Amino acid sequence: NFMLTQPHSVSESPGKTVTISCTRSSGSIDSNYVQWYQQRPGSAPTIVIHEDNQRPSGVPDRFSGSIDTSSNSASLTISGLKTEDEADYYCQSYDPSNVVFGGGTKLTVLGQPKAAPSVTLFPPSSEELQANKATLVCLISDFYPGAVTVAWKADSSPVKAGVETTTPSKQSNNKYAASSYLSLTPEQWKSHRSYSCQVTHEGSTVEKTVAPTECS
Amino acid sequence: AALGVQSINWQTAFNRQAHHTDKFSSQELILRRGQNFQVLMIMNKGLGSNERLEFIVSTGPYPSESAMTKAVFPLSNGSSGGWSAVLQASNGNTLTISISSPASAPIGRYTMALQIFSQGGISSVKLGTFILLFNPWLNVDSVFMGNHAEREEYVQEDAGIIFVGSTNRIGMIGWNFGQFEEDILSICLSILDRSLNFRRDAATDVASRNDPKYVGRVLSAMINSNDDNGVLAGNWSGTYTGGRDPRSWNGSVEILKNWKKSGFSPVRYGQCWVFAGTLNTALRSLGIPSRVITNFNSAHDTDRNLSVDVYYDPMGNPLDKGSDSVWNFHVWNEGWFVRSDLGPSYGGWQVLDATPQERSQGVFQCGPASVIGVREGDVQLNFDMPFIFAEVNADRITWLYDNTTGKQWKNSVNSHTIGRYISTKAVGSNARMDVTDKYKYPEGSDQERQVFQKALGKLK
Amino acid sequence: EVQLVESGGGLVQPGRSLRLSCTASGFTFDDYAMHWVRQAPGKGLEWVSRISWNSRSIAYADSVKGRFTISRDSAKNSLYLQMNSLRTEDTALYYCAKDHYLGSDSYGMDVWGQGTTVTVSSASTKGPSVFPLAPSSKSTSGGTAALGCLVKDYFPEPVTVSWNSGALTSGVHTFPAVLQSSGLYSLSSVVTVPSSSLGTQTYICNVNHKPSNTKVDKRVEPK
Lengths: 216, 460, 223
Ligand SMILES: *CC(=O)CC[C@H](NC(=O)OCc1ccccc1)C(=O)N[C@@H](C(=O)N1CCC[C@@H]1C(=O)N[C@@H](CC(C)C)C(=O)OC)C(C)C
Ligand SMILES: [Ca+2]
Ligand SMILES: [Ca+2]
Ligand SMILES: [Ca+2]
Prior knowledge:
The complex is a heterotrimer of chains A (216), B (460) and C (223).
Chain A: E1 4-5, E2 9-12, E3 18-24, E4 35-39, E5 46-49, E6 63-68, E7 73-78, E8 87-94, E9 99-101, E10 105-109, E11 118-122, H1 126-130, E12 134-143, E13 149-154, E14 157-159, E15 163-165, E16 169-170, E17 176-184, H2 186-191, E18 195-201, E19 204-210
Parallel strand pairs in A: 2-10
Antiparallel strand pairs in A: 1-3, 3-7, 4-5, 4-8, 6-7, 8-9, 8-10, 11-12, 12-17, 13-14, 13-18, 15-17, 16-17, 18-19
Chain B: E1 5-9, H1 12-19, E2 30-32, E3 37-43, E4 52-59, E5 70-76, E6 84-91, E7 94-100, E8 108-118, E9 121-133, H2 148-154, E10 159-166, E11 169-176, H3 184-192, H4 196-200, H5 202-207, H6 212-222, E12 232-234, H7 253-261, E13 267-270, H8 272-286, E14 290-300, E15 307-309, E16 312-313, E17 317-318, E18 325-336, E19 349-352, E20 369-370, H9 371-375, H10 385-393, E21 395-397, E22 413-414, E23 420-425, E24 432-434, H11 436-439, H12 447-456
Parallel strand pairs in B: 2-9, 5-6, 12-13, 15-21
Antiparallel strand pairs in B: 1-3, 3-7, 4-5, 4-8, 6-7, 8-9, 10-11, 14-18, 14-23, 16-17, 18-19, 19-20, 21-22, 23-24
Helix pairs in contact in B: 3-7, 3-8
Chain C: E1 3-7, E2 10-12, E3 18-25, E4 34-39, E5 45-51, E6 58-60, E7 68-73, E8 78-83, E9 92-99, E10 109-112, E11 116-120, E12 129-133, E13 144-154, E14 160-163, E15 172-174, E16 178-179, E17 185-194, E18 204-209, E19 214-219
Parallel strand pairs in C: 2-11
Antiparallel strand pairs in C: 1-3, 3-8, 4-5, 4-9, 5-6, 7-8, 9-10, 9-11, 12-13, 13-17, 14-18, 15-17, 16-17, 18-19
Bound molecules: a molecule of 5 linked components (P6S-ONL-DVA-DPR-MLL) and calcium ion (3 copies).
One calcium ion (CA) is lined by residues 221-222, 224, 226-228, 230, 364 of chain B.
PDB class: transferase
Assembly: trimeric
Chain A: Antibody fab fragment light chain
């Protein structure tokens, strides 16, 4: 058993070179062959590298694969980026039974300036509380590239259960937006001092906070 | 400040060149046994009069001094005989050190650590790892091959030629041994750690790796899938569903890689030349100079009587009685080593066959067999000399097997149809050497018959 | 060219069964392992199952073991996935894939089908409830304020949202829906407006759910 960990996102400008790593959690990366796949939005995956470093017929030589024993990782390098290279990329390997995919990396080919997200965190509405439910809604807009990670805190502690996050999608203005939800009982809402939504974009974190006793 | 190691310069490129391992694609330190290498060790200070550096080298999972798989040796000013470390020069904090291994040392992957005694304390650090191979440039190693051209062919040549087909229709195929391609030396070392021999007694298996008879025979087992999940699964069906047609492989590299990457699961499918070419990679990678031998009209004798028996019920009818067969061609390997178990007169080329034809001590393995021995009919000797005698110089008998009294009298004896145009690649070119005369005395002469006879009386 | 065509996908209820088929052409089917891989909307690839060339070696993801059975049929050049005891979390696009490797037990997916969609839900048609996401007390005076509607618990997709009956479009974003473990969808819509507008413009989201023939208006009032 092992996992393959990839970065959530990478980006570069047209004509530049970008690398996507894929780290194996246990066992040696070179014990088993690594494949890479490209998947464009709304399309089936296609293979771009097989057997660690071989290229299928007709894949441009701009795509290359490598293995680095010392970091227990495989890498996909794309030189001379073209706008069509914008896609999700997945690494894959196996043990003698099970196939393992990496979690995927969104490659953005930069076509506008980077833009930090605007974040608004809404507490449960009184109407929802009156229907004995409680949803915290964290709305994220105006960012680019279109990739974020979201973390929730109850008081100062991580909370994973009851979280659902949407994949970013394009706004009118061609930047991206995303949403995340924390579903609570009214009792959980009233039971903590505060809740926080933390959004990470391009290495920077934005946090917003709400509490049951404040903001009226 | 207590005496410690700041850093070590292994002088890898330099030592690899002198050890003749500079061609492998690898950043490892690859070395040959019986031969010194030089390192520079940068300490935090000078050696004091009372402080001691001990080197430790171990290979395999249960290493021990008595099995010769761990060694402990002081940094010294003297000539010692085993593993040794000689201090050539000190220059401030930097020590210039000449390490050698014995010529009898197990081949494999080793770990190297240094244990320091100073200030009534002890420190112990891992310096690194190396691979140690057989050394055919070293006159005392059992694999010594003194002729230089022969050595470059049979060790350092990564591309070859196998002869194939039938006496009337000779062909030849390109074969990339590829011993120097990435991961291949490493994979060939893996092989030894996956044998039955190793699964059942690792400690003793690894101690036996000093011996090319032993390494060589394990390889004859492990290159086929039978018994042990070795590298290649043979298929002579005609139907090559679920894998590659044997005729479609071009060399060993994809084979060995595919084996490793599937988690040491067999590769589909091979025939004899595919076994012989893969075994040749393994033998050349580890330091056993080797070559590919093809034999036309190769006997498969299935009962140790030096003859291929197609039986006839009296009154002249064919019968289904018979396991004995004959192949159009067969391909195996010869490895170069002395035979300390046999006598100085039996050294040189030794047959090794990884094709699963007959079992040997219950396993699909074959060899080593003194070619010289087979020719002299000395077939009582280890290993498998009856099978391989039959291969190249069986007679072909026809018989009369009475269904009723149990009597068995011979119709006709054909003493020359077996083992023809025996062939291997030339040194330096792609020409065909005939080596029939190396495997047997001339067909249709006296000595040839009196050695067949000698041999037939050595089966008992 | 290799073609793989999946079929058998559909909407199916928890606890029921569904059989996926994949027909293969343009290569020698029996030479290769085959796989099923699935992908939940907006998520990653999750391998499901593998069957060897000769059907003698089979493997399953832990998350489906004992519930799903893979099989193949040589004369029909087809792969199958019998899915029993389905769960809301089995919702995904199911892809058929041919293995790259010939003659060795390594695994990679050289060709993929377009996939067949499986949605697992017990829901019937249902219109949403709509809740206000009221703008901040604080509001950033001189600058902007976000406010929104939370559109909860509808089936099936889709819902469309406008603001002030189409009169407000600048700064509107309507997010994709999430499918809840209940088998019902939710989404949100947001608009960023001038803070000086609060308490002089009324803000109303108009939620349209054509499958239920419901339109729902919700006024969003500053705190
Ligand atoms: C070492 C091997 O694995 C030999 C296998 C051999 N395969 C091929 O010949 O493959 C063709 C090839 C083409 C190009 C390059 C490389 C290979 C093989 O199976 N040989 C024949 C064979 O010997 N067999 C099968 C069982 C017996 C039969 C045979 O014909 N034997 C006769 C004697 C020999 C011809 C001397 C015999 O006794 O009866 C006719 C097979 C027919 C292909
Ligand atoms: Ca074997
Ligand atoms: Ca016989
Ligand atoms: Ca003869």
